[PDB]
Structures are given as C-alpha cells and as structure tokens.
CSV table of C-alpha atoms in Angstrom, one decimal:
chain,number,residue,atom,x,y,z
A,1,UNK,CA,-18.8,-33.0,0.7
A,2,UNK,CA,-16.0,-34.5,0.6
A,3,UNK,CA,-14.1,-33.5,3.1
A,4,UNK,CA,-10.2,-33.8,2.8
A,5,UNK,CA,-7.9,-33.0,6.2
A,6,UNK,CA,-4.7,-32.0,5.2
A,7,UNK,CA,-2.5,-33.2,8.1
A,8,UNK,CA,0.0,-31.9,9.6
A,9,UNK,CA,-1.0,-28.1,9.3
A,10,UNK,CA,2.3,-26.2,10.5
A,11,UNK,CA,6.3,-27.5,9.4
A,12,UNK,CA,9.5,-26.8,9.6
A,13,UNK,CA,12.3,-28.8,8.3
A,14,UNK,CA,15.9,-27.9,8.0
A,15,UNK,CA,17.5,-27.0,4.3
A,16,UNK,CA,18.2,-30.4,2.6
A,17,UNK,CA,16.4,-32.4,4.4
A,18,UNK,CA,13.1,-34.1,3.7
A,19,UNK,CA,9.4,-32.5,4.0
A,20,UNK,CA,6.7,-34.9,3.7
A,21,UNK,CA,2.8,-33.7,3.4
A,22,UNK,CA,0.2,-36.3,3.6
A,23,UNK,CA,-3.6,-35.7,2.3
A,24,UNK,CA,-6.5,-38.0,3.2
A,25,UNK,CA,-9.4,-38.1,1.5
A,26,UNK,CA,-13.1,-38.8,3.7
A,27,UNK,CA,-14.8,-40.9,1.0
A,28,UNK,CA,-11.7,-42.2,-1.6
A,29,UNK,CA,-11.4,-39.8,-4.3
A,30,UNK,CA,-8.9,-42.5,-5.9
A,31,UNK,CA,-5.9,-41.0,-8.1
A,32,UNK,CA,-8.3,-37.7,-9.2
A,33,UNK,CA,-5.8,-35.8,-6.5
A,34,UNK,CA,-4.2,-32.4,-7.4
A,35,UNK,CA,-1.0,-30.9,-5.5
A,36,UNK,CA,-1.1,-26.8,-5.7
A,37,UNK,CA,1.7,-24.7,-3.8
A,38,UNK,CA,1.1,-21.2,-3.0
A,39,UNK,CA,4.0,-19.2,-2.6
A,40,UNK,CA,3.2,-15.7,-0.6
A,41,UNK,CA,1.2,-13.5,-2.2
A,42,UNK,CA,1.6,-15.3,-5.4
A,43,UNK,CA,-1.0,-17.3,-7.2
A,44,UNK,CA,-1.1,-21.2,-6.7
A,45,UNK,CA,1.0,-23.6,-8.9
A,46,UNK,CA,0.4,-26.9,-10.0
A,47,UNK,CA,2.5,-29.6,-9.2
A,48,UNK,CA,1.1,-32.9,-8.6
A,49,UNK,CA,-2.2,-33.7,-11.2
A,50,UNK,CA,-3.3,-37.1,-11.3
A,51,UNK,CA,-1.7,-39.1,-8.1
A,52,UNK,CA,1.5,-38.6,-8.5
A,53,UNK,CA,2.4,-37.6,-12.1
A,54,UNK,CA,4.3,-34.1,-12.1
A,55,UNK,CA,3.1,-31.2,-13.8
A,56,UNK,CA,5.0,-30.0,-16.8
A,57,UNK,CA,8.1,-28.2,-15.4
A,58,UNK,CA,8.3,-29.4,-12.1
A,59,UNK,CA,11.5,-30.8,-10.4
A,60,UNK,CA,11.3,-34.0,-9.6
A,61,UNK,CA,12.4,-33.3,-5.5
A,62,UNK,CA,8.4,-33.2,-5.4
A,63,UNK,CA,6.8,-36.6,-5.8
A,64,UNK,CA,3.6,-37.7,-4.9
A,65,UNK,CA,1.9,-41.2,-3.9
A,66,UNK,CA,-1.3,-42.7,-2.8
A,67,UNK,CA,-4.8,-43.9,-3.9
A,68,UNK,CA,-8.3,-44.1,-2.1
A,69,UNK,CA,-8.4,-42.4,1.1
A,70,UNK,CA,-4.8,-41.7,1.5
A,71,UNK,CA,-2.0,-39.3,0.3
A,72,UNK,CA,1.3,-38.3,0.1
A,73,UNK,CA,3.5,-35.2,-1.5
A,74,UNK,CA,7.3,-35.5,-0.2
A,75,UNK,CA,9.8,-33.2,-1.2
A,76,UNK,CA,13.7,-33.9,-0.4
A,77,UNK,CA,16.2,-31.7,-0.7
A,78,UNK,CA,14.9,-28.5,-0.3
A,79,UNK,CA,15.5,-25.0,-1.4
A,80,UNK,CA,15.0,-21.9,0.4
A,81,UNK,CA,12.4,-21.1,-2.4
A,82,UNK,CA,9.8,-24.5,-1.2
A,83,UNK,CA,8.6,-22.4,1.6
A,84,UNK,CA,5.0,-22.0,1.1
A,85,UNK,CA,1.7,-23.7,2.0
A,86,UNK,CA,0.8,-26.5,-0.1
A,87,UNK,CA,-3.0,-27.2,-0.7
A,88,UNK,CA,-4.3,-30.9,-1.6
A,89,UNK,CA,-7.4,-30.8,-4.2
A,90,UNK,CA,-9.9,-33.4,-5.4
A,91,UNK,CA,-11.6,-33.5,-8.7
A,92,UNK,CA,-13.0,-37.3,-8.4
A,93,UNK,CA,-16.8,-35.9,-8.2
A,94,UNK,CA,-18.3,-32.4,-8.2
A,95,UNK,CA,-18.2,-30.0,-5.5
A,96,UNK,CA,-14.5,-29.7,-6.1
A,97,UNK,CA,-13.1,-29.4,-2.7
A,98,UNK,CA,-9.6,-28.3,-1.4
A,99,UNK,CA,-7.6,-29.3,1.7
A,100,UNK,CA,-6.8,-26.4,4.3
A,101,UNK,CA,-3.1,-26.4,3.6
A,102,UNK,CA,0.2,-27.5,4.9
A,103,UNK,CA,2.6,-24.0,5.8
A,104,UNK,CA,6.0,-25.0,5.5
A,105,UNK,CA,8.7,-23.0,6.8
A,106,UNK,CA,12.3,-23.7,5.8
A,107,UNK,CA,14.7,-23.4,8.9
A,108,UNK,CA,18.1,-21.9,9.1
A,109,UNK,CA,20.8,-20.8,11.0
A,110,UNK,CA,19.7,-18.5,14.1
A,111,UNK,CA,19.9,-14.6,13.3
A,112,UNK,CA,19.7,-11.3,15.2
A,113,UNK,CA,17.1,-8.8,14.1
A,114,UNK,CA,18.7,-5.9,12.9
A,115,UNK,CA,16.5,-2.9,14.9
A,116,UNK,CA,15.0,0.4,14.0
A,117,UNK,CA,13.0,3.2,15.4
A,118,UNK,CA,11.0,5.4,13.4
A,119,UNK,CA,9.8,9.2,15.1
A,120,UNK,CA,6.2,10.2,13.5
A,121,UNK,CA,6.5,12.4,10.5
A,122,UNK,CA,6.0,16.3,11.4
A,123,UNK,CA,3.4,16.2,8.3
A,124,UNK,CA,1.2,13.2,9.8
A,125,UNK,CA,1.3,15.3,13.8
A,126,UNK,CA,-0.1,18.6,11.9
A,127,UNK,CA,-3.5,16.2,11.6
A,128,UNK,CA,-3.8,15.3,15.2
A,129,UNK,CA,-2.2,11.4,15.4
A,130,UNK,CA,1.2,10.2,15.7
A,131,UNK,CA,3.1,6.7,15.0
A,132,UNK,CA,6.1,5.3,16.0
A,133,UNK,CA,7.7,2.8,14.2
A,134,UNK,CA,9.9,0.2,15.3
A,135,UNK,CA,11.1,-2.8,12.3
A,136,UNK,CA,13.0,-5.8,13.2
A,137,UNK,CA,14.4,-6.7,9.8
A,138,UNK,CA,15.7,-10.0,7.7
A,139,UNK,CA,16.0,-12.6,11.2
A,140,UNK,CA,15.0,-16.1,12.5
A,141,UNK,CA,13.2,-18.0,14.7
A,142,UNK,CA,9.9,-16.0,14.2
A,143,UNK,CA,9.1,-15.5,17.8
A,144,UNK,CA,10.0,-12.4,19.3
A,145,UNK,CA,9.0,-10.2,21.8
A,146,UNK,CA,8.8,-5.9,21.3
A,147,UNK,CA,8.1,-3.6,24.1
A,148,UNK,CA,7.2,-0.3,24.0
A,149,UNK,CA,8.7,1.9,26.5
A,150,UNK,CA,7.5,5.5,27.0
A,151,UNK,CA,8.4,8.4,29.5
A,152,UNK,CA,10.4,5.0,30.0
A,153,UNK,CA,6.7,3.5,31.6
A,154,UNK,CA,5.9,0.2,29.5
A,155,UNK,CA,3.1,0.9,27.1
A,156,UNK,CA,0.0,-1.8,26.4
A,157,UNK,CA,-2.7,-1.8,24.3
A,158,UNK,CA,-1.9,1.1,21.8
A,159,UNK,CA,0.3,-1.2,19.6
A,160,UNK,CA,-0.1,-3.3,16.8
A,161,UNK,CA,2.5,-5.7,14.8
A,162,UNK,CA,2.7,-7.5,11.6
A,163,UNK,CA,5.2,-9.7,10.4
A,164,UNK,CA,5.9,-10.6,6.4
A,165,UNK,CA,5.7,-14.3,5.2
A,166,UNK,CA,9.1,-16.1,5.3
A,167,UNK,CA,11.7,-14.3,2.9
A,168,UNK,CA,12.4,-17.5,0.1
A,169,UNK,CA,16.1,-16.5,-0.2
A,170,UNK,CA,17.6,-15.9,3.6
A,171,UNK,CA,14.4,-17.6,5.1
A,172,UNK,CA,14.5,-14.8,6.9
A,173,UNK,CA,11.1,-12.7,8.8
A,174,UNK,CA,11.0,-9.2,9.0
A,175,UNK,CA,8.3,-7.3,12.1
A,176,UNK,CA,6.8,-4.1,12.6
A,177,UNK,CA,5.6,-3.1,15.8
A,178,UNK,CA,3.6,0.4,15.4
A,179,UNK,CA,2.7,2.7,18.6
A,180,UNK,CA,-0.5,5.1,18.2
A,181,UNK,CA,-1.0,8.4,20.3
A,182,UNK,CA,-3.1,11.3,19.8
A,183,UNK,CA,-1.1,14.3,18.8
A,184,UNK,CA,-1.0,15.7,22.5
A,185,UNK,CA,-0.8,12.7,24.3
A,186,UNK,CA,2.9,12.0,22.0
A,187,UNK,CA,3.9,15.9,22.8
A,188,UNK,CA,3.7,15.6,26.8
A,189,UNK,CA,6.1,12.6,26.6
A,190,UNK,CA,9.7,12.8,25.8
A,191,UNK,CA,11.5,9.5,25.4
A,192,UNK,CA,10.4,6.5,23.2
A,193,UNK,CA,11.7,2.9,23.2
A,194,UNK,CA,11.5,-0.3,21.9
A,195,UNK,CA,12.5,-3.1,23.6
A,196,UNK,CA,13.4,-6.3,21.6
A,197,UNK,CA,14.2,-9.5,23.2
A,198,UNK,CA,14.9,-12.5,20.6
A,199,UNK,CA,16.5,-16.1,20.9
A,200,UNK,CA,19.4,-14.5,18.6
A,201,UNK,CA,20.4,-11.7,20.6
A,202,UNK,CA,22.1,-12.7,24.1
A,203,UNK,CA,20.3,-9.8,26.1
A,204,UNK,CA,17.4,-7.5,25.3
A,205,UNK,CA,18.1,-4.8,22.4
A,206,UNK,CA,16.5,-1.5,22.5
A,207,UNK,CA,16.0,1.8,20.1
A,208,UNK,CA,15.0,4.8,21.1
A,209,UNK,CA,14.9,8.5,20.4
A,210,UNK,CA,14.3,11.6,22.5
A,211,UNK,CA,12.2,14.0,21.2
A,212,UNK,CA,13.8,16.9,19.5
B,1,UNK,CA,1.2,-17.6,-21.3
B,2,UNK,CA,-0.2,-16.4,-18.2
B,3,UNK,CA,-4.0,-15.3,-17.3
B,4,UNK,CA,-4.9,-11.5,-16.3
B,5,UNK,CA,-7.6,-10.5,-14.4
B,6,UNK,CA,-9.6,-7.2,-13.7
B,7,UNK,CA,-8.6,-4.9,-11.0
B,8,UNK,CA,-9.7,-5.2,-7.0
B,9,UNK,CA,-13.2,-3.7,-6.9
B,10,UNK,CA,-15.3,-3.2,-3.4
B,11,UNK,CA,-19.4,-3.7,-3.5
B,12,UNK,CA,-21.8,-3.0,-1.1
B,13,UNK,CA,-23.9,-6.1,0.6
B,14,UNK,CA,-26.6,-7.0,-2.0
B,15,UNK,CA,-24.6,-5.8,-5.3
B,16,UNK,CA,-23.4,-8.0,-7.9
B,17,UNK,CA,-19.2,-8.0,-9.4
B,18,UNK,CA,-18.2,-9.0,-12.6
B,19,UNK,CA,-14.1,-10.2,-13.1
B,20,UNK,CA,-12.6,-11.2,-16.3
B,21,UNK,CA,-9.6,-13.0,-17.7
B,22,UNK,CA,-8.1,-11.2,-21.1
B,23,UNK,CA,-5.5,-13.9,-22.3
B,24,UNK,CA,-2.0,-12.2,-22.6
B,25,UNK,CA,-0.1,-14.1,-25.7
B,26,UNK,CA,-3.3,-15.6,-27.5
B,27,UNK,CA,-5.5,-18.1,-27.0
B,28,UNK,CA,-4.5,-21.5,-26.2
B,29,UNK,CA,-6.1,-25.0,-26.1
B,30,UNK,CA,-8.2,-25.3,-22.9
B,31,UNK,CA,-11.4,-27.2,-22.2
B,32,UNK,CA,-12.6,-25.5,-19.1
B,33,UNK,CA,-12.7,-21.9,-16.9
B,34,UNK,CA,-13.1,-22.3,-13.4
B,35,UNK,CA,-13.2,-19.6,-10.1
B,36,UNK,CA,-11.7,-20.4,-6.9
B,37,UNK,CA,-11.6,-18.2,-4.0
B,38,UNK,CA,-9.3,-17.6,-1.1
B,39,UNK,CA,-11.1,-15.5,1.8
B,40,UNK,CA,-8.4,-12.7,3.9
B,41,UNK,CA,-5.8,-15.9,5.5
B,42,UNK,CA,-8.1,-19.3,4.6
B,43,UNK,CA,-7.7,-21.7,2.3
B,44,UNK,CA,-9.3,-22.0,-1.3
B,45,UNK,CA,-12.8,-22.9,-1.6
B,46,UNK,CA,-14.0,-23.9,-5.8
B,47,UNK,CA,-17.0,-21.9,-6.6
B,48,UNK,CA,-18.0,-23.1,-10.6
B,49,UNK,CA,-16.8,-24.3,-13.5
B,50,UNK,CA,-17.8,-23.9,-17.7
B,51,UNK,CA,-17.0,-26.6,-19.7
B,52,UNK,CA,-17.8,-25.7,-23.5
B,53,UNK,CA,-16.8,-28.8,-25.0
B,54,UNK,CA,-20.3,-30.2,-23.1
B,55,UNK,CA,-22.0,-26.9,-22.7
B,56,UNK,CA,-22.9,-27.5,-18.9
B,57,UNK,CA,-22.1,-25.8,-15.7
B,58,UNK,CA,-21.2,-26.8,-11.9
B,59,UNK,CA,-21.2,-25.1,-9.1
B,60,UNK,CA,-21.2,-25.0,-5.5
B,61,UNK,CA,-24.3,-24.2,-3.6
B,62,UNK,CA,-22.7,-21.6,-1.6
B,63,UNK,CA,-23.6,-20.0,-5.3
B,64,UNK,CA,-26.4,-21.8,-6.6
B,65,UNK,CA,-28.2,-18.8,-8.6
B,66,UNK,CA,-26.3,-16.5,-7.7
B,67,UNK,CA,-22.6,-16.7,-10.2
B,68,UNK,CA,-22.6,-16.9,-13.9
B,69,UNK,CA,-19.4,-18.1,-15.4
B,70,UNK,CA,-18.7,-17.0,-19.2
B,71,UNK,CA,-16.4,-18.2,-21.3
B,72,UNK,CA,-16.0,-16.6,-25.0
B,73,UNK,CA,-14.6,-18.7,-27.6
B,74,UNK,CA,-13.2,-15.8,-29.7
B,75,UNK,CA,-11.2,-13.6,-27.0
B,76,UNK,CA,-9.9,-17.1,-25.3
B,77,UNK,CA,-11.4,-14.6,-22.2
B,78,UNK,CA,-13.9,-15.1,-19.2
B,79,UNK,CA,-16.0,-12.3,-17.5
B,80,UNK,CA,-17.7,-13.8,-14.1
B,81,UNK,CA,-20.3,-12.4,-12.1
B,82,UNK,CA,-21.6,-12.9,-8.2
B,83,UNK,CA,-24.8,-11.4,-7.8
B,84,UNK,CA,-26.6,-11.0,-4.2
B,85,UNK,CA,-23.1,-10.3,-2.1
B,86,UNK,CA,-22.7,-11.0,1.5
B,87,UNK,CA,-19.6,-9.3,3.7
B,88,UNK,CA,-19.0,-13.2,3.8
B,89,UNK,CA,-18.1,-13.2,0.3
B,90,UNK,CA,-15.5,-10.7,0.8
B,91,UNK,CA,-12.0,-12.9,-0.9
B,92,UNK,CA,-9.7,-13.2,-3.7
B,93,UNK,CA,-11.0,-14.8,-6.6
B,94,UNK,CA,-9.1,-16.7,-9.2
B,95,UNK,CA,-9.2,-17.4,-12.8
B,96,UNK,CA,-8.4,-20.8,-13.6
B,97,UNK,CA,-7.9,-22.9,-16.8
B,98,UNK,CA,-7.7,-26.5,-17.4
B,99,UNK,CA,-6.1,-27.9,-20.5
B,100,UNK,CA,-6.9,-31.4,-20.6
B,101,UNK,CA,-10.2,-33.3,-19.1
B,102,UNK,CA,-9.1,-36.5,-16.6
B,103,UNK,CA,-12.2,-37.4,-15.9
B,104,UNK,CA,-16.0,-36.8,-17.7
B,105,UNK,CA,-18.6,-38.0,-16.0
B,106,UNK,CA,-23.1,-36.5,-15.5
B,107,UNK,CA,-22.4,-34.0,-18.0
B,108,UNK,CA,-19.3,-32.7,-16.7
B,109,UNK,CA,-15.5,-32.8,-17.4
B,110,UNK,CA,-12.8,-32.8,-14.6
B,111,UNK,CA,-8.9,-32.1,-14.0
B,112,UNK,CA,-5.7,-30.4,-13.5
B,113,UNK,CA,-6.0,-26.9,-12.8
B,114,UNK,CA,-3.1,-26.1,-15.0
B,115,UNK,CA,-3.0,-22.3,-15.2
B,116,UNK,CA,-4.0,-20.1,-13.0
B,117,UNK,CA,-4.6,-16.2,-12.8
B,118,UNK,CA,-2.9,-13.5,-10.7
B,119,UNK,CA,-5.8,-12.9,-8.0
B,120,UNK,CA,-8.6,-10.1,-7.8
B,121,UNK,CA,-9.6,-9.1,-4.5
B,122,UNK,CA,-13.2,-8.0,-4.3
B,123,UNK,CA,-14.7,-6.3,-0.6
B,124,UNK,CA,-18.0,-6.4,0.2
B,125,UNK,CA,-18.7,-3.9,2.8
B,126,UNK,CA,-21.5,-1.1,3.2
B,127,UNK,CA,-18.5,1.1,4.3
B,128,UNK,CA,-17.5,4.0,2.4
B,129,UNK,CA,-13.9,3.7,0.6
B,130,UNK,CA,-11.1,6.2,1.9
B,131,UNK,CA,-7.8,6.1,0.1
B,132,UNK,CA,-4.8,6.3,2.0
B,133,UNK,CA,-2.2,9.4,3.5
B,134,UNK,CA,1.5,8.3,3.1
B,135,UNK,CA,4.2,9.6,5.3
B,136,UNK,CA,7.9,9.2,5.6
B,137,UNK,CA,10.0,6.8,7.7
B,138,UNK,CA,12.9,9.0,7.6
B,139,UNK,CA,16.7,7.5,8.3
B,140,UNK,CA,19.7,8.7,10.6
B,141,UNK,CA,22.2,6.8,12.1
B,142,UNK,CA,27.3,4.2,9.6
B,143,UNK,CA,26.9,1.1,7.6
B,144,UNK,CA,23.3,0.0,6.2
B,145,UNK,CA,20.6,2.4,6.7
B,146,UNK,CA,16.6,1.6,6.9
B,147,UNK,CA,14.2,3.9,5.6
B,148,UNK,CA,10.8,3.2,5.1
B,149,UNK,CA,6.8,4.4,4.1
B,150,UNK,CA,4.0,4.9,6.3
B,151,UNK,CA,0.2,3.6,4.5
B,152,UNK,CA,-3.0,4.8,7.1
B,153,UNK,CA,-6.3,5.2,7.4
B,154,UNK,CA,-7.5,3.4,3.7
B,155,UNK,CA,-10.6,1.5,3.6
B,156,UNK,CA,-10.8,-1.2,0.8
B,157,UNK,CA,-7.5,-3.2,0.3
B,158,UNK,CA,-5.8,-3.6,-1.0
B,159,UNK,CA,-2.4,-1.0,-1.5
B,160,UNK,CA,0.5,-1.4,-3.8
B,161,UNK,CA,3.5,0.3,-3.2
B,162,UNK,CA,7.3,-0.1,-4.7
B,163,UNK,CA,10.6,2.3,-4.7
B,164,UNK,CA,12.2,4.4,-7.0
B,165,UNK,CA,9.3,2.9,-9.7
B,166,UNK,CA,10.0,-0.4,-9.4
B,167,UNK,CA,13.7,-0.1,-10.0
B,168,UNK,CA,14.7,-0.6,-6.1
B,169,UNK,CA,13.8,-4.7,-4.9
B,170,UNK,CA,16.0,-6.1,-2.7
B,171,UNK,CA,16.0,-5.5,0.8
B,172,UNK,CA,12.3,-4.3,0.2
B,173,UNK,CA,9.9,-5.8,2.7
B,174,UNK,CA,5.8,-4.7,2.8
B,175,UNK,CA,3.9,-5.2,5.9
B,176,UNK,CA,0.3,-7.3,5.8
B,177,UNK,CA,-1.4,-4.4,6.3
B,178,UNK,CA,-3.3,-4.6,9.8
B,179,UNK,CA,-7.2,-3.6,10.5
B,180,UNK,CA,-7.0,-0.4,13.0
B,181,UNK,CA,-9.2,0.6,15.5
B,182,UNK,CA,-10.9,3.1,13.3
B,183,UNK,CA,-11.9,0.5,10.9
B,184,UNK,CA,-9.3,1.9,8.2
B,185,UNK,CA,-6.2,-0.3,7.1
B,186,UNK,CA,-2.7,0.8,8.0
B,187,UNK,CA,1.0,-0.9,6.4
B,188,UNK,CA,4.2,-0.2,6.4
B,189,UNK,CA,7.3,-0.7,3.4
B,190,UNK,CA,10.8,-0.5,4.3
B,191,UNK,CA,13.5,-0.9,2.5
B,192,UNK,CA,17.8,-1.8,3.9
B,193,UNK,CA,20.0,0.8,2.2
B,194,UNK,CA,23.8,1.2,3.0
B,195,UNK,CA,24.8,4.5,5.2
B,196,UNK,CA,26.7,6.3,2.7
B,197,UNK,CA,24.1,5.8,-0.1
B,198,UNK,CA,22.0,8.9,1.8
B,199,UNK,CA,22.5,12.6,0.3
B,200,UNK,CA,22.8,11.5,-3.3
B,201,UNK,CA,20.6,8.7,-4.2
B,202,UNK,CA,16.8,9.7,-4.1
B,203,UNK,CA,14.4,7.7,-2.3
B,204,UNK,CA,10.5,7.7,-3.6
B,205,UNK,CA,8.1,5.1,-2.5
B,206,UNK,CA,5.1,4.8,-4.7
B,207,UNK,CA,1.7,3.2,-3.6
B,208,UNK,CA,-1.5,2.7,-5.7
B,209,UNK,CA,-5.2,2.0,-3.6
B,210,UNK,CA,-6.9,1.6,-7.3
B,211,UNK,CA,-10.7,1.0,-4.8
B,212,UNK,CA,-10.5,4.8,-4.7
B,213,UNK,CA,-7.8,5.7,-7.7
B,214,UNK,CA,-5.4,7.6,-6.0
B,215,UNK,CA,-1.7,6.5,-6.6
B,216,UNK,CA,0.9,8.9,-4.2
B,217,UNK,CA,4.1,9.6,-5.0
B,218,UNK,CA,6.4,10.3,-1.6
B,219,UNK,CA,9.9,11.3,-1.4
B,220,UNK,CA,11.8,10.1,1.9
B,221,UNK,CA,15.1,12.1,2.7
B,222,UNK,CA,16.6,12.3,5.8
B,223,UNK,CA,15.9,14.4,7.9
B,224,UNK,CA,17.7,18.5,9.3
C-alpha cells in the first residue's frame, strides 16, 4: 500500500532549460526507488535504479536524489526527444507500486497549424454515412479551437477530435476534428467548413469545400 | 536484446488469456519475470513476479488466484495467464526482466526492472469483434500536399497502419483512435507530401486489426 504521489503531474519547460520531477514515498521506501520514462506509444525505459545510480546507457542530464520519503529526478538541458511521462516505482517491500506519472512537454517556438479539409469518400457514402475530415498538422501551443460550419450554420455535437502525443523532433501536435452525417442528411447540404482559431494564427483560418 | 510478446487478443468477461515472451537474440542472465499493466491512458499498476533463483511467487491481490506467471529455464521465455476476466482488466500488459536482485527479503528478490517488452493489449468485452473499412483522404490543392486514411467502425483495438509498407515515415502522424457512438473505434493516418510528388509517386496505406485478422491494403490517388 504504499502509496507514492508523483507531484507535479503536468510540465512544460523550455528546450535547455531544467525539468525537475520529485517522487515522495507515503511510508519511506529508502533508496529501493526506480525512475521509468515512457515515451508515446513506446514501452518504458529505465533510467534511475537504486536512488540515483543511472541505468546502463543513460546520459547523465538525468540524475536522481533522495532517500526515505522523498525524491527527486532532474534533467538539464533538454532535448526535444525528453518529452514523455516519467513514472517513479518502488521495490523496498512487495506490492510493487508505481507513481501516476509526471507528462512533460517540451516547449518551443509558437507555430501555425497548417489546415486541411477532407470530403467523405464516394465508396464510404454508397453505405449510408459520411465524414468529413479536417487535420491541423505539425503546430504549437496545444490549445485550439475547430468549428464546424455547415450550409454555413455552426454544427455541435456530431464531431469528434483527437490529437497525437507531442512530436519528439519539432515538439510539434497534430489534430483531427471528424464530422459524422447520415448519407442524406450530408447530400441536402452543400457547403462544409472548418473554422480554426489558434494562438499562432493572427485571425481565424478556415477550409472548406462545396460539394461537387 | 529486446523481449517479444504475443499478439493483442480480446476475451470475453469470465475467460482466461495467456501472453508470452520468446527472447529474440538468446537467453541472457536474468533472475526474475514480472507483468505490469497500463489500463487505456493510466498509469502502470505491477501485477506478479517469478523469481527462480528462490522458487516463490508475489503478487497483487487484485490477482490473488487468479494469474500464473511461468518462467522456462530452457527458452529464456515466459507464458502468463489471467484467469476469471473482468471489463476492468481490459490494459496493456508488459513483460519485464530483472537482471540483478537489490534487495531479498520473505522469500523474495527485488529490483531494477531492466528490460522490458513491447506491450500486448488484451480487451475484455462480451462484444463481438468487427474489423475495420478503410477509405481514402484524397488530396487537391501547390507546395506540400496532405493525404491521409480513414479507420471506422472496428471493435477490439487495437489498428496498425503504415505507408507504402513501411517505407514512407516522416511527416506520418496516426490519430488515438476515438470510441464512436456506435461502440466501434474510428482513426485517422495522414501523412505531409509535397504538391508535385502527386501523379507519379503511389500512395498505399496499410492497416492490420490482427483481433479479427484482416490486414487492408488501400491506394489513395487524387481524385477526377
């Protein structure tokens, strides 16, 4: 049961700078603390075993520190490739328990989403659906906002979005906002839109495509 | 000198799953196989633990009588097996191998978890798998293009998919695939692709959904 909170949960530090991650144990695991970062999608990697004493192949940006009921992984100078969560564990007594993580996003310079619109596929409207597509790719802060206009009235509720993991190059996102209709409903309407507003791009942006 | 694990299987509530861990390269000195899971967006929660060198077992009781961990000395492999499955077991699971003990203590050893394997997601649902229809995300435009792949209506994840088999990466982003309505997954892949490339280079997007084993090959040209 021992419980260990992983504080702070969400960061973002500028490139070169230093990120510091601190781990605190409920009942002193003293020095039996691991450091795992999880890179999206991928597996997790060791880095830290023992308190502080790096894993084989690790540079040495990452250093850890602390004993007890306290803990501490700082890493300086960092790369575009050290976004990722980074997960605390403790092996001092059985159940084996993790902390819930430490997301770390890697700021950069401001950039525009690049926007496209994508007209449903004359294959998938012979079923009886239809989807629109609209992709903000490779840009940064992650908050943005995507409209849907259609018939040019603003659509709600028949959209859903998803958004990739930070790129580990650019540190880039990339967005998909996808609009659902019924085969009829999408053939009485002529004009479809996406609206994009972002802290990158001085004014709203917006695709769109009339039907044939 | 990396771990392998069995494919992404789905159950049904009440069923029992069995993952392994086949060694690629040989064997290598380890004292210990553990599993860790990692439900849909959580963190990682340690379900049990073999340690030959003592011949004993841990686990969590999340799992008490219900997981068998199995650790062949030969094959430098481990099968595991969850028996009695709730939707709430529905995660990744992950192979893990420690190659030095830190710490023995009640009949157990304790470290590192220096290697760990790629990830097998296993579903637990009473619903029925349906493998996915792909269509195109066509281009049109004068400088970088975007064309792209459209995943619905699947069941289990997860879906695979890459370009040109595997030989197009960069400027390739996948969507998280997001839950629809219907109860059937959706995603999207897209892929950044200068104007003038259109016309003669061939664009194919491949995506496996092994829960159902149906891989689909589609080719995205623009459109007349």
């Amino acid at each position: 049961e021992i419980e260990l909170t992983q504080s702070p949960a969400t960061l973002s530090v500028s490139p070169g700078e230093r990120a510091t991650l601190s781990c605190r144990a409920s009942q002193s695991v003293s020095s039996n603390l691991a450091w795992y970062q999880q890179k999206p999608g991928q597996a997790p990697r060791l880095l830290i075993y023992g308190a502080s004493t790096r894993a084989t192949g690790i540079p040495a940006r990452f250093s850890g520190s602390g004993s007890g009921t306290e803990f501490t992984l700082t890493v300086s100078r960092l790369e575009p490739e050290d976004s990722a969560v980074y997960f605390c564990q403790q092996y001092y007594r059985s159940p084996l328990t993790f902390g819930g993580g430490t997301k770390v996003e890697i700021k950069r310079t401001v950039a525009a989403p690049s926007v496209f619109i994508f007209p449903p596929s004359d294959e998938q409207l012979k079923s009886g659906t239809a989807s629109v597509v609209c992709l903000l790719n490779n840009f940064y802060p992650r908050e943005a906002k995507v409209q849907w206009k259609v018939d040019n009235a603003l659509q709600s509720g028949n959209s859903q979005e998803s958004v990739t993991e930070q790129d580990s190059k650019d540190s880039t996102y990339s967005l998909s906002s996808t609009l659902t209709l019924s085969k009829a409903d999408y053939e009485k309407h002529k004009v479809y839109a996406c609206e994009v507003t972002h802290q990158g791009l001085s004014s709203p942006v917006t695709k769109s495509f009339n039907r044939g | 000198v990396q771990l392998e694990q069995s494919g992404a299987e789905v159950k049904k509530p009440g069923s029992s799953v069995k993952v392994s861990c086949e060694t690629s390269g040989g064997t290598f000195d380890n004292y210990a196989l553990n599993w860790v899971r990692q439900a849909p967006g959580q963190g990682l929660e340690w379900i049990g633990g073999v340690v030959p060198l003592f011949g004993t077992t841990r686990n969590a009781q999340k799992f008490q009588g219900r997981v068998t961990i199995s650790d062949d000395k030969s094959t430098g492999t481990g099968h595991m097996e969850l028996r009695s499955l709730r939707s709430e077991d529905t995660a990744v699971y992950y192979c893990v191998r420690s190659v030095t003990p830190r710490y023995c203590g009640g009949g157990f050893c304790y470290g590192e978890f220096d290697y760990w394997g790629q990830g097998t997601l296993v579903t637990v649902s009473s619903a029925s798998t349906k493998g996915p229809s792909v269509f195109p995300l066509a281009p049109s435009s004068g400088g970088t293009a975007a064309l792209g792949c459209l995943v619905k209506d699947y069941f289990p994840e997860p879906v695979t998919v890459s370009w040109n088999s595997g030989a197009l990466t960069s400027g390739v982003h996948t969507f998280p695939a997001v839950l629809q309505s219907s109860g059937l997954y959706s995603l999207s892949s897209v892929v950044t692709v200068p104007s003038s490339s259109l016309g003669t280079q061939t664009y194919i997007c491949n995506v496996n959904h092994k829960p159902s084993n149906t891989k689909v090959d589609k080719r995205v040209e623009p459109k007349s």
